[PDB]
Design a protein around this ligand. Structure first.
Ligand SMILES: *[B]([O])([O])[C]([C]C1=[C]OC2=[C][C]=[C][C]=C12)[N]C(=O)[C]1[C][C]2[C][C][C]1O2
Ligand SMILES: *[B]([O])([O])[C]([C]C1=[C]OC2=[C][C]=[C][C]=C12)[N]C(=O)[C]1[C][C]2[C][C][C]1O2
Ligand SMILES: *[B]([O])([O])[C]([C]C1=[C]OC2=[C][C]=[C][C]=C12)[N]C(=O)[C]1[C][C]2[C][C][C]1O2
Ligand code: NA
Ligand code: NA
Ligand code: NA
Ligand code: NA
Ligand code: NA
Ligand code: NA
Ligand code: NA
Lengths: 199, 213, 223, 204, 203, 214, 196, 116, 197, 199
């Protein structure tokens, strides 16, 4: 898996690969690892599929009732805390990392890491087995003040680069752009991927 | 895997005289081959006529020490009197045995006066076995100090020697010498020697320097 | 053990503590950890005491044979090679951590040799259980081309930091100053812990030990 | 532990122009006492003795293999061995088995056959020598012996003063060790004579 | 440890050594390995010192409660049974405690062996501890049911002294008791090495 | 926590005339990966107390929530009483010991710095409940590198000024950056005085690499 | 699990050994002999692991017999005990260590009677009396209690019988019969077996 | 769980529920007990169509103890079976059998507990 | 390591058990009894781990005695054997499993004599003859060879003696004395112990 | 460790970090991991220090005698096979990866990987614990036809990027440029390193 989230002025971009693998076996080659927690809040799933899906579902349920009682859409900080609390309370029994990103009327576009029950707000964040091979790339290619299109391009190049080096990442790239306007879901097919050195 | 224990070192010693009791310890707190602090004495005043020396895993020393303090207060409120040295010793055996399957990693030596005003020493193992002694060494250097005490205080292995009782002056110099010898040979004993003297007047404290390496 | 080394203006200075511990019990308060290799090559040892003793002895012996045959003063890189290749063959089973310091036709050199056979040439180094205390003092105040007196001071401070901070280290600081005109072995250059005296009045009156058997064998017949 | 299988204690102590060497006399296998007169101190010259504690079989093998090399040495050299040379000879012997050692920690005590100056030393199981100017200890009660020695030892003791110091240091040390004891034997080595004494010791 | 007890014409003899060991280190040269529950009830102790002291003191508290409740002392069979049940309750927990409950009740002299497994045997001779085999050899060789009090005291003191000589985990002093119809009497507390020296001097 | 995840390295601390100073880098490592190079491992507890933590970051963030809420609770009473540095240190010992005794520790080693009633406070607590006071503290690998330098200066001059303590701490952070492979050249320095708790950062040490030519 | 005992008197050595050859829960032999004649005045009593005991005892025996053939005289009990220890110690750190516990009883023309104890590690001890096996835990204190250095052979057999009776009473293993032999200036003498 | 206090004190210091339970005893068949020298005798007052065995008011608790009752017979059966279990539980915990006083003390404390 | 044996005849059940109580290498007791009376006509012979044997046997005994007190009649040997099996099987997968091997011998007025074998797993078997312990490996073939269903009590004791002699001859463990009892229409009868010099 | 080698027209560029670490302890912070095997042949050392130094020394000795018997400087392919054969013969007992690069009058500038006893010629190659984090970077930044200065810049940026992410890499960067003209050794100090995103 390679998951990635980038903050911009007015929203976030989230991306993931599509490979689900049981060892050397690709069980699902077109899995969308970007799940909605609320109207403008999404999470990026990595690690154990069963744990990631269980946490995402409980967080979506908790946030739905929270949103209704508060008479407003939940804050992205409330969503990130909801996820972080489940991941931290059950840290010895869960093996998933759910990156939480989205938009708010108070803080706007924000990206949060919950790795092992911690919580940190990042300009961008990468996760999954594939993130290992692109740490230097994201450090060399990240520039502050990127536009929504520049963030999508960055996420696509970084995820394509990891997909090519990582046996556990592959398939298509799923992109999601969350702004005040709504959410744009996009798919970059395995044939239309950006090309780099591959020898 | 996680180990709930760690060895922090330290040596304790108690001597009971006709009308006194000494409880001494070094002041070094260690971990591995490093020193946490050079000012960690191991004597804890419980009542005006009883002090306790504690050595071993320091997390347990702190905890057990606070438990003893709370228990003395609980007893004073229920019985309208302070716990005697003997009563503290019997109670401490039960607190240690309450943890027989997750022991407190603490070597305890109680020193004070009994109800006849005579000196009393009570030594324990981590799980609660105890008895009253005339003298006892505990902690890292206990094996070094004890045979000297057996010889010089118990008069063992000596023929044609006057079995003269132990005076406070004589005991003080012997505690100072054994802790100088212990600091020379035990890496976990050093920095300073805290001596607590219990008498009818009360509790006096002395601090004497020990080797810093 | 805290062993340290340092390269200064006109040579090298090797430093060592004097404690030998047998598992948390101090066995020797005054052992020599600075070993002779060649007149202008010395070696500090740490690790398994027997392995450090026999490996230094072996290379000093090989270096005497090398110098006798060549007719020249031995090189510091030769003792590094010989030590390295002997230790490598034993796969770390010969537990000798050594600091080789010396002066040859190419100037002062300092090396760290590890039990597995790896090495490094350095301006300053520290080994033993007290190596991080010594290394902190060296990183904090080392400057290249130090005077003999400035380098000796830094070395004594580095070994002392280890003596006081490390439980496996103690006693005195021994040092060896190697220059182009030979080596000055400063046995007990400093004693961080001043004589710890006591009222050790422990005397037994003759007859307090009960004896069961006695046999006297004279030797005056041979004399 | 291998060293505690048989147990035992050995110690050497330096005096003014004399040396002392002492050992316990127990031969036991774990908790069972077998013998109360086991020899642990072996003469290597008129004024030179070796004390061996540890695994009983290796105490006997090291003493026998050392005697072999010593006899060949004094025959080739036509002279009595010096104390320091006997130490180096034991070091070589022990280090030859660096990766499968003898389970014994020797103690050497003697006077120079020419200079008469007292010598004491000890070696670990793999032959690392340690010379001291006071005392050396080896055994299952090394902590007990270090405490007794550190407290009782004095710089220039006369033969009788030394005899009482080493006796009380051994007696009181081995009486806090379950697997050492059954008696203590002491050798006082002077220029003119060797005094050997067995002490009245605890038998439990 | 070495503990022994035997019934004879004049009651029950009960003897113990006094050594405590922390591995090969002698942590205590003289511990009391006998608990005096009441004037007609003793308990010898071997195994884990803390287990012995706590459980035998818990049996003592229960015996005391029985006397307050019934105005009569507990029987040796009921006291040994109470301790045996305490051990059964903690089976598999790693307790280590061998004891002999020795006394005099309405059925005459009583002697029971109780284990940390819950073993409970009545009998007229037992020995527990690391030195028990050495005590059995001596005790069995010199035993007669018609031994005089002084002949019985010699057998007890000898079985323990001889066990302390061979067993490295036994030593110190012999603490011997004689359980008579009118209660126990502490016979002696004698240094075991002095006894062994005395035996040797007679050879 | 049975297995720590994102961890922080050494936390330093030294008492000076008029207060305490603590220092800690801003790194969260995931094994050898310098995964988060901009996280604060220092916390202002109240006006008198500050805390720095080595070990698992998620466990530190939890403690920071529990501690922060305790301070809010106390401030709601407004009764003239407030937790002293010594009481926070005491609470943290009980909290760590309690978690250790349940075989589920909070995987951290902490340094509590404080200033109350004219006295400087410096205390250590580890994941087992081992606690004590000292004139200087250094957790993790800093106990081997930084503590010998803090003690060397405190031997010569037991009472340092705020500037003397600050320069010494900055020299320790430089030695730690050079010798600790789990450190980063980005750190904070927090100071507690009569004025309160001030956290400064991000700071960096001027490195020198001239030995690369020796 | 097997039993060896030796009692050395002023001019003799009395030795005994059990007669059971066992396999698992079965006594396969009730009349088995554990003693080995080395010389006219030396017996080697051997116990331990199944193969090791006879292999080790027989090798020593044939090499002791080889010495007699090559030189016209036999090895002394001391020389035989030390030769046995040298072989056992040399095998200790080798591929083939022998798990044997033994007793060597002998009579020398100059030195007199001797009893040597040796364990499988090859520690060698001279003893006035000794025993091997679990039985020694029950019988060593009987010998401590009744043995005196001037014990007559008549008294030694009653002391031996006391030990063997203790095994019948307290030892959980059968062991009903025992081989009994005594060595003196006139060689090795077979005594009647002790039976229960 | 039903936690109502059934037996409580009345203004005069009476426990009416216990006094009402004594009225039920007063209506039971007369039971008589006599302690002799080597024997103890129990006798109880007495339908032709009834099997006498199924309705005997003299029960054995253990080999050495027996009892008779007067009052509510279903209540008696509960007291009797608890006494019977207790006699065996006593032999199991202390070995020795129950005394007449020990089992009387057990039955009396059971009855008292049901009043508080 | 301990021995139990039962031989069921036409109107009786003969049982025997060793009398050793042992600890480590020592015979602590030579007169120990391994039989437990349940009813007037039932014996439970119990063997196994040190604590378990008496704890289990006594609990069953007191509950069998409780049945007699509550109902005025005793449990049949079958009902007692099945009640013993139910308790042992219920503890099997619990925190407290008892490591006991046992034999239940009884006489019922209607069913006649019965011998039940039960192992620590709680398997229950009715047998004409049975044995427990390592001794059973040496004595089961003796019973296979000489047992006939019409064996008289006189002949049964001779057969029992043949088995006990084999243990003296071939079993490595001491076991010198044996408790012997027989049950019939008149209850439990103590016979003389079998002893070997 | 982070080691890197790049082929260009007329020679090679090799780079390494300078950190030698025993767990969390930096034992040597200025170690040069670029060792000469011959006049124009170098190797980059990674893995076990004792093994890497032992192999490098035996290879230098073998190649010196080879060059003298052949009266020519050894081919880089001969140096590559000398190292490779040693690493392969003793693959179970050795734990080092020696990258071999240099210049020849026959094949010019060539880079060879000898990972676990295999042999492969690469346009560029990366190795060491630090190489993991820069796979995506080297795949995104590598361009064919780079000049000697562009190769040095690429090696420096890639190694600096790994040094910042890897706890086991750090210090200064050592560069070596091998051409027909000779060898140029260069050092980029820990203060003069290229800067990228580092938060
Ligand atoms: B990734 O870290 O390699 C990946 C994430 C993944 C794949 O499929 C899903 C479905 C729902 C949430 C997350 C997710 N992990 C896996 O493919 C693994 C294989 C299997 C065992 C752990 C997990 O599921
Ligand atoms: B014996 O079994 O070796 C002995 C019993 C013992 C020791 O101290 C006491 C005090 C009270 C009753 C019994 C008792 N045990 C020991 O020597 C050891 C000391 C302690 C730790 C293991 C064992 O108990
Ligand atoms: B690297 O992979 O982290 C590195 C390679 C290295 C460092 O220093 C040298 C010296 C000589 C050849 C290679 C080399 N490894 C190390 O630094 C480690 C330190 C030590 C323990 C494992 C290895 O050697
Ligand atoms: Na892929
Ligand atoms: Na010290
Ligand atoms: Na030190
Ligand atoms: Na020694
Ligand atoms: Na002893
Ligand atoms: Na003993
Ligand atoms: Na780095």
């Amino acid at each position: 898996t390679t998951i990635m989230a980038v903050e911009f002025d007015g929203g976030v971009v989230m991306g993931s690969d599509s490979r689900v693998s049981a060892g050397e076996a690709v069980v699902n080659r077109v899995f969308d690892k970007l799940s909605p927690l609320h109207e403008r809040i999404y999470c990026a799933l990595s690690g154990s599929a069963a744990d990631a899906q269980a946490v995402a579902d409980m967080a979506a349920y908790q946030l739905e009732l929270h949103g209704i009682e508060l008479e407003e859409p939940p804050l992205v900080l409330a969503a990130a805390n909801v996820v972080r609390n489940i991941s931290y309370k059950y840290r010895e029994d869960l093996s998933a990392h759910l990156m939480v990103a989205g938009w708010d009327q108070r803080e706007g576009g924000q990206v949060y890491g919950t790795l092992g029950g911690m919580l940190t707000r990042q300009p961008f964040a990468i996760g999954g087995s594939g993130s290992t091979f692109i740490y230097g790339y994201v450090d060399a290619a990240y520039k502050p003040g990127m536009s929504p299109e520049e963030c999508r391009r960055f996420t696509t190049d970084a995820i394509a680069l990891a997909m090519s080096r990582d046996g556990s990442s592959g398939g298509v790239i799923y992109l999601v752009t969350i702004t005040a306007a709504g959410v744009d879901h996009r798919v970059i097919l395995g044939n239309e991927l950006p090309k780099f050195y591959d020898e | 895997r996680f180990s709930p224990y760690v060895f922090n070192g330290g040596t304790i010693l108690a001597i009971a005289g006709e009308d006194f009791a000494i409880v001494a310890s070094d002041t070094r707190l260690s971990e591995g081959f490093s020193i946490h602090t050079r000012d960690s004495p191991k004597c804890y005043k419980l009542t005006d006529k009883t002090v306790i020396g504690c050595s071993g895993f320091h997390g347990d020393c702190l905890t057990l020490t606070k438990i003893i303090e709370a228990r003395l207060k609980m007893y004073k409120h229920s019985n309208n009197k302070a716990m005697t040295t003997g009563a503290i010793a019997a109670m401490l055996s039960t607190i240690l045995y309450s943890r027989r399957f997750f022991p407190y990693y603490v070597y305890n030596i109680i020193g004070g006066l009994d109800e006849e005003g005579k000196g009393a020493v009570y030594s324990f193992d981590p799980v609660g076995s105890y008895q009253r002694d005339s003298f006892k060494a505990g902690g890292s250097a206990s094996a070094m100090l004890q045979p000297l005490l057996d010889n010089q205080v118990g008069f063992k292995n000596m023929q044609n020697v006057e079995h003269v009782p132990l005076s406070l002056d004589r005991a003080m110099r012997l505690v100072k010498d054994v802790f100088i010898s212990a600091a020379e040979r035990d890496v976990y004993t050093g920095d300073a020697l805290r001596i607590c003297i219990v008498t009818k007047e009360g509790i006096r404290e002395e601090t004497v320097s020990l080797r810093k390496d | 053990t805290t062993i340290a080394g340092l390269v200064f203006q006109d040579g090298v200075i090797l430093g060592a503590d004097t404690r030998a511990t047998n598992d948390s019990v101090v066995a020797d308060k005054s052992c020599e950890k600075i070993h002779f290799i060649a007149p202008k090559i010395y070696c500090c040892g740490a690790g398994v005491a027997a392995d450090a003793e026999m490996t230094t002895r072996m290379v000093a012996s090989k270096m005497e044979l090398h110098a006798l045959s060549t007719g020249r003063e031995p090189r510091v890189a030769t003792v590094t090679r010989i030590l390295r290749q002997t230790l490598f063959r034993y796969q770390g089973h010969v537990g000798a951590s050594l600091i080789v310091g010396g002066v040859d036709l190419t100037g002062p050199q300092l090396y760290g040799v590890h039990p597995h056979g790896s090495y490094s040439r350095l301006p300053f180094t520290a080994l033993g259980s007290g190596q991080d205390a010594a290394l902190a003092v060296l990183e904090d105040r080392f400057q290249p081309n130090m005077t003999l007196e400035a380098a000796q001071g830094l070395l004594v401070e580095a070994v002392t930091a280890g003596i006081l901070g490390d439980l496996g280290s103690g006693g005195n600081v021994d040092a060896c100053v190697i220059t182009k005109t030979g080596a000055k072995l400063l046995r007990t250059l400093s004693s961080p812990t001043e004589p710890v005296k006591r009222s050790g009045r422990y005397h037994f009156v003759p007859g307090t030990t009960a004896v069961l058997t006695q046999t006297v064998k004279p030797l005056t017949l041979e004399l | 532990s291998i060293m505690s299988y048989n147990g035992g204690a050995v110690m050497a102590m330096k005096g003014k122009n004399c040396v002392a060497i002492a050992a316990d006399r127990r031969f036991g296998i774990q908790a069972q006492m077998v013998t109360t007169d086991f020899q642990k101190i072996f003469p290597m010259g008129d004024r030179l003795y070796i004390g061996l504690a540890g695994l009983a079989t290796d105490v006997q093998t090291v003493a026998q293999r050392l005697k072999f090399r010593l006899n060949l040495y004094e025959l080739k050299e036509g002279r009595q061995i010096k104390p320091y040379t006997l130490m180096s000879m034991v070091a070589n012997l022990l280090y030859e088995k660096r990766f499968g050692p003898y389970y014994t920690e020797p103690v050497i005590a003697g006077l120079d056959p020419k200079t008469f100056k007292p010598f004491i030393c000890s070696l670990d199981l793999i032959g690392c020598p340690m010379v001291t100017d006071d005392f050396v200890v080896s055994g299952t009660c090394a902590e007990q012996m270090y405490g007794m020695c550190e407290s009782l030892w004095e710089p220039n003791m006369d033969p009788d003063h030394l005899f009482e110091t080493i006796s009380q240091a051994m007696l009181n040390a081995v009486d806090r060790d379950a697997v050492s004891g059954m008696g203590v034997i002491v050798h006082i080595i002077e220029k003119d004579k060797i005094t050997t004494r067995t002490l009245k010791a605890r038998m439990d | 440890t070495t503990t022994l007890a035997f019934k004879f014409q004049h009651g029950v003899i009960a003897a113990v050594d006094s050594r405590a060991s922390a591995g090969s280190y002698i942590s205590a040269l003289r511990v009391n390995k006998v608990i005096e529950i009441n004037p007609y009830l003793l308990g010898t102790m071997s195994g884990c010192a803390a287990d012995c002291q706590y459980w035998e003191r818990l049996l003592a508290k229960e015996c005391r409660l029985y006397y307050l409740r019934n105005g009569e002392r507990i029987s040796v069979s009921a006291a040994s049974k109470l301790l045996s049940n305490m051990m059964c309750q903690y089976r598999g927990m790693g307790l280590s405690m061998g004891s002999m409950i020795c006394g005099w009740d309405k059925k005459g002299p009583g002697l029971y062996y109780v284990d940390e497994h819950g073993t409970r045997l009545s009998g007229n001779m037992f020995s527990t501890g690391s030195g028990n085999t050495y005590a059995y050899g001596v005790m069995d060789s010199g035993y007669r049911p018609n031994l005089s009090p002084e002949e019985a005291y010699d057998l007890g003191r000898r079985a323990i002294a001889y066990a302390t000589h061979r067993d490295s985990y036994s030593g110190g002093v012999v603490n011997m008791y004689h359980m008579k119809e009118d209660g126990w009497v502490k016979v002696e507390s004698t240094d075991v090495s002095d006894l062994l020296h005395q035996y040797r001097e007679a050879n | 926590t049975q297995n720590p995840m994102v961890t922080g390295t050494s936390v330093l601390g030294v008492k000076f005339e008029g207060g305490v100073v603590i220092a800690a880098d801003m790194l969260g490592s995931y094994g050898s990966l310098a995964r988060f190079r901009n996280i604060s491992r220092i916390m202002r507890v109240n006006n008198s107390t500050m805390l720095g933590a080595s070990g698992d970051y998620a466990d530190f963030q939890y403690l920071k929530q529990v501690l922060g809420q305790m301070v809010i609770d106390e401030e709601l009473l407004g009764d003239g009483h407030s937790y002293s540095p010594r009481a926070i240190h005491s609470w943290l010992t009980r909290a760590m010991y309690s978690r250790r005794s349940k075989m589920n520790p909070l995987w951290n080693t902490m340094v509590i710095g404080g200033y109350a009633d004219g006295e400087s406070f410096l205390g250590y607590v580890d994941m087992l409940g081992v606690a004590y006071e000292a004139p200087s503290l250094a957790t993790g690998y800093g106990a081997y590198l930084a503590q010998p330098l803090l003690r060397e200066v405190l031997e010569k001059q037991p009472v340092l000024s705020q500037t003397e303590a600050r320069d010494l701490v900055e020299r320790c952070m430089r030695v730690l950056y050079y010798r600790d492979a789990r450190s980063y050249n980005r750190f904070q320095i927090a100071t507690v005085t009569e004025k309160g708790v001030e956290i400064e950062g991000p700071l960096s040490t001027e490195t020198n690499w001239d030995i690369a030519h020796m | 699990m097997e039993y060896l005992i030796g009692i050395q008197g002023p001019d003799y050595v009395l030795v005994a050994s059990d007669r059971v050859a066992a396999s698992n829960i079965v006594q396969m032999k009730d009349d088995h002999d554990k003693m080995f004649k080395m010389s006219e005045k030396i017996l080697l009593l051997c116990v331990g692991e199944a193969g090791d005991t006879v292999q080790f005892a027989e090798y020593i025996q044939k090499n002791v017999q080889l010495y007699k053939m090559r030189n016209g005289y036999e090895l002394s009990p001391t020389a035989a005990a030390n030769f046995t220890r040298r072989n056992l110690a040399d095998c200790l750190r080798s591929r083939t260590p022998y798990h044997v516990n033994l007793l060597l009883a002998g009579y020398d023309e100059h030195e007199g009677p001797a009893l040597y104890y040796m364990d499988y590690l090859a520690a060698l001890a001279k003893a006035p009396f000794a025993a091997h096996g679990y039985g020694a835990f029950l019988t060593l204190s009987i010998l401590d209690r009744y043995y005196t250095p001037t014990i007559s052979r008549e008294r030694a057999v009653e002391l031996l019988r006391k030990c063997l009776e203790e095994l019948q009473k307290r030892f959980i293993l059968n062991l009903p019969t025992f081989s009994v032999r005594i060595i003196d200036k006139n060689g090795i003498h077979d005594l009647d077996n002790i039976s229960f | 769980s039903y936690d109502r206090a059934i037996t409580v004190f009345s203004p005069d210091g009476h426990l009416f529920q216990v006094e009402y339970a004594q009225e039920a005893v007063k209506k039971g068949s007369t039971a008589v007990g006599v302690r002799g020298r080597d024997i103890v005798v129990l006798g109880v007052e007495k339908a032709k169509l009834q099997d006498e065995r199924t309705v005997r008011k003299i029960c054995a608790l253990d080999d050495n103890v027996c009892m008779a009752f007067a009052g509510l017979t279903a209540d008696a059966r509960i007291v009797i079976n608890r006494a019977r279990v207790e006699c065996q539980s006593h032999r199991l915990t202390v070995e020795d059998p129950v005394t007449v006083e020990y089992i009387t003390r057990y039955i009396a404390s059971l009855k008292q507990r049901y009043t508080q």
